[PDB]
Assembly symmetry: C3
Homo-oligomer: 318 residues x 3
């Protein structure tokens, strides 16, 4: 049979990639046509060679790719990079997650920014975009999930077709919650709640609502993982992130609204301080809390701390 042939197959990457893909700070490289193979490899090791029908999975991946746009940062590369961070979290916390959760989270990560234009929810609201009228909160993230479902509904694209309806509904809920959690506006309340539950000892991974929160934080951690790479990667990725911010800032000015300094290309000198503020208020607390809840995710925090030191070095002019 088809599932039998797939059970005998072994997907391999080049030697260097096989070794370094296990590292949290792994970079997926500039060869776009290798990314699908990298994702499939990650799925095979974390879930198993029989989790998805290979032909369907490849079809799904290429359709997802086609629905990411040619923008500086929120592109196809970002999707696969976020998926890799989730892979590393899953592999280092392997006894914690179900089969469905492992399937769902890698797929959710790949799909989490589908059809992103490179603008924030705030801009869409201010521009009075049709999407903002349809989704009052988490505008883009609700759209990302809608795009995911549309791709799954295409002929030969339902990678979950072997699941029972019960399991199908469960994995789609996992995916929906995970994608919505990537709305950074929801992160602040989530981390604060998780911190309180961790300190009191009420935090229980057997409680579904607690579990959803932890997954939500994992999604933030993966989404922000540019700050957890080695310095050369972290610095170069920041260029792409700010390219998008400045473009939004330009568009804000066109609406007659002065953008925040983060999005203003006339205030490039304020970036190092802005980075310091971002690490202190967002990135460091994210990985600190995640490390508390999941100690094997420690390397993410260490790398984030190291990049913080590097930005401080920039500020001093060193």
């Amino acid at each position: 049979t088809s599932e039998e042939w797939q059970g005998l197959m072994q997907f391999t990457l080049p030697v260097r990639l096989c070794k370094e893909i296990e590292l949290f700070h792994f970079d997926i490289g500039p060869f776009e046509n290798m990314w699908p193979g990298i994702f499939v490899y990650m799925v095979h090791r974390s879930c198993g060679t029989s989790c998805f029908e290979l032909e369907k999975l490849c079809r799904f991946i290429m359709s997802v790719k086609k629905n990411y746009r040619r923008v500086p940062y929120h592109n196809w590369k970002h999707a696969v990079t976020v998926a890799h961070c989730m892979y590393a979290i899953l592999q280092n916390n392997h006894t914690l997650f179900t089969d469905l959760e492992r399937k769902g989270l890698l797929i959710a990560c790949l799909c989490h920014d589908l059809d992103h234009r490179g603008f924030s929810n705030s801009y869409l609201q201010k521009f009075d975009h049709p999407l903002a009228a349809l989704y009052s909160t988490s505008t883009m993230e609700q759209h990302h999930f809608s795009q995911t479902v549309s791709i799954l509904q295409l002929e030969g694209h339902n990678i979950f077709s072997t699941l029972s309806s019960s399991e199908y509904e469960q994995v789609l809920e996992i995916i929906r919650k995970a994608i919505i959690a990537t709305d950074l506006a929801l992160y602040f309340g989530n981390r604060k709640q998780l911190e309180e539950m961790y300190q009191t000892g009420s935090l229980n991974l057997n409680n579904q609502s607690h579990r959803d929160r932890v997954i939500g934080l994992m999604m933030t951690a993966c989404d922000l993982c540019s700050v957890t790479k080695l310095w050369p990667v972290t610095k170069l990725t920041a260029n792409d992130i700010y390219a998008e911010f400045w473009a939004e800032g330009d568009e804000m000015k066109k609406l007659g609204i002065q953008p925040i300094p983060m999005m203003d290309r006339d205030k490039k000198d304020e970036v190092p301080q802005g980075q310091l503020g971002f690490y202190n208020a967002v990135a460091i607390p994210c990985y600190t809390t995640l490390t508390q809840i999941l100690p094997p995710t420690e390397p993410l925090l260490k790398a984030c701390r190291d990049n913080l030191s590097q930005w401080e070095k920039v500020i001093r002019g060193e």
Copy 2:
């Protein structure tokens, strides 16, 4: 019937766009997939919901879009922007124009830069481009009109198929004259003639040759409308315009010909003075004459004057 269903339909934009589209200084935004809807809305309000068969119009628009190139300034965005300026002129001078003229001018504006490479007529002549051998004068503009006719001749693309042959020939003439008028080399003689006719009182909109001239000036005014937007839009658009000039300047240097300072990227410091010269010699007289002939177009002149003040502010280092 089909025309009956269309008569009952109402096309609407988001609330902010409905309000601000009526403003001369409106910016169409960075969401490309909203531009076709914006154009259709403008056609519906200025001409009527029964001027074009909707399915044919949409097919036509997408084909026009496909025939604009990915260049910094003479692109699909420019086409829709010029069309909007014409919409605002038409709406504020609504008793003056026939049904055919309103149809023709919006379509002419959308098609006026079809297949533009981002190079001027002068460069094509000097490079000895096949187009320059075919069209000795108004080289690109003659090509734009030829592209328009080619699109109209495609199956299911003749948006004027309901017109009589007499009316069809009239609208195509309106379109041809309007597109040729966007050759800025022809503007100087046209404005000068219009100024003389306005001062003597010989200018008569009932005279076809006079009428053609006024339409020609309207086309220049719409074509140049970047200088009539608010300062943030005007300044950012100037970046795109000069990107193309510098690219042509590079190509001129490759032919062994020193380009004019306007096209020389080594002389970026001369841009503010070059802008002052452009407003004084071209933009201000254009909108001054247009305002004299059509007083409701006044906001274009006011905005042009304000941008002139801003460029003077740049020169002073303020």
Copy 3:
């Protein structure tokens, strides 16, 4: 018949292009859709109007075009530019080459960088790219030839189908050797061998191994021809070349490896000196040796010397 109709046809370029295409320092221009016609013209003058079936040749050219990537320098424009330099060498040494060699070398030049990503062999090795595992030496060049053969094997794409098998095998060998010779790592040993054979008088164009070497040097000379154009072209092309180097340098840093100064975007100030070093160690000796072997290629050397003087002028701050 079909070959008879083609024998009566005459392909012509615009007047300026017909004249200036014969010059070694000719620039092909920014009009992409004219490049196929330029190549066909060169083939017709150097080989003959009956060397290729026109319909097959055009199909082949468009497929080759489709398999070049949108990279700063190793793109479709580079392919046609290298082909032009070969055309000029062939035309000025017209009694030396067979029909097969003229066919082969122009096609080899057009195909010599097929599917280039803008990265060197060294980067692919260090990234552990699948291609490096398959081709241990001349990694990209072996891939370029493989892409060439794949295009020729497509239906209606075998432009050499009229050749006998013997001749077909000969032209494919000419093409293979020529493409492999564009590996600049192989150039240094080749030029050194040719210099020794020239000085002793052992160099004999009737010896196949000697002939292969000379063709190899011709391929280097054509590949590097940016340094043989007039200064404005040479300077602007250098921008594209370094754009690719800096991108590779960024990727090297992402692997945790400090790149050589040539590829480091933080060391832009070292470029003029790097250019001086490149001309002295690579470009000048290449064209000096080529001019010794083929005196009519002299203009390439003169232009290279002139560009060397220009870079020295930059260093002095003049």
